[PDB]
Amino acid sequence: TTPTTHHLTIPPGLTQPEFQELAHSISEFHTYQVGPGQCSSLLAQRVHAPLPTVWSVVRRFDKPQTYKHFIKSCHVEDGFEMRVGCLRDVNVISGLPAETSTERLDILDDERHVTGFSIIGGEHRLRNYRSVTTVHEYQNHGEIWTVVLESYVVDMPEGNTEEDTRLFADTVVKLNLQKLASVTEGMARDQ
């Protein structure tokens, strides 16, 4: 039941001035109860596109393939809509052939720009994976840009280290953030 002393160290991807405005956001959405057989992390990605552009992409639970790599396809239900509890099936691109991922939408607030999900089924090391992602705007005496924060807590596999598990998860997440920043800086530049 131990917390996650998280808002005390800069995530790479964030200058110090930005890590100030987000102290409260990090403590509110990106701190977890991790202690027994679990690990967690927070990653940051600076996007140079308007915040509504970013959130319009970030919010689509049904098209994660739009900003994450390694997704052959995502299937939602016909009787589904963009709401907490809706389920999506993800076909993964990996070394094995029949690798799917059943994920449940846990959070989705179109006014605080908060979203999050959990992995409820499918074959993988990352067991009991749960993620929260928030979107923030920044205005540095002038330019104005978005900041995306993504955190997770995940059951560390047995025999697999804490580092090797976060190290992998960090990389997956960092690269999707890079992808989102590009898809969205690409809608923005053309405006």
Q: Which residues bind ligand A8S (CB under 6 A)?
A: 68, 70, 92, 94-95, 101, 119, 124-126, 129, 131, 169, 172-173, 176
Q: Which is nearer to ligand A8S, 15 or 37 (CB)?
A: 37
Binding site for its own copies (CB under 8 A): 69-70, 72, 93-97, 124-126, 157, 159-161, 163-164, 167-168, 171, 175
CB of residue 84 to its own copies, shortest distance in Å: 29
CB closer to ligand A8S, 21 vs 65:
65
Closest CA to 179 of 71, 29, 26: 71
Minimum distance from CB of 165 to its own copies (Å)? Answer: 8
Partner touching 51 among ligand A8S, its own copies, none, CB below 5 to 8 Å by kind: none
Nearer of residues 126 and 188 to its own copies, judged by Cβ? 126
* HEC secondary structure over the chain: CCCCCCCCCCCCCCCHHHHHHCHHHHHHHCCCCCCCCEEEEEEEEEECCCHHHHHHHHCCCCCHHHCCCCEEEEECCCCCCCCCCCEEEEEECCCCCCCEEEEEEEEEECCCCEEEEEEEECCCCCEEEEEEEEEEEECCCCCCEEEEEEEEEEECCCCCCHHHHHHHHHHHHHHHHHHHHHHHHHHHHCC
Q: Which does 56 bind (CB under 5 to 8 A by kind): ligand A8S, its own copies, none?
A: none
Closer to ligand A8S by CB, 15 or 73: give it.
73
Task: Give 70 or 80: the residue with its C-beta nearer to ligand A8S.
Answer: 70
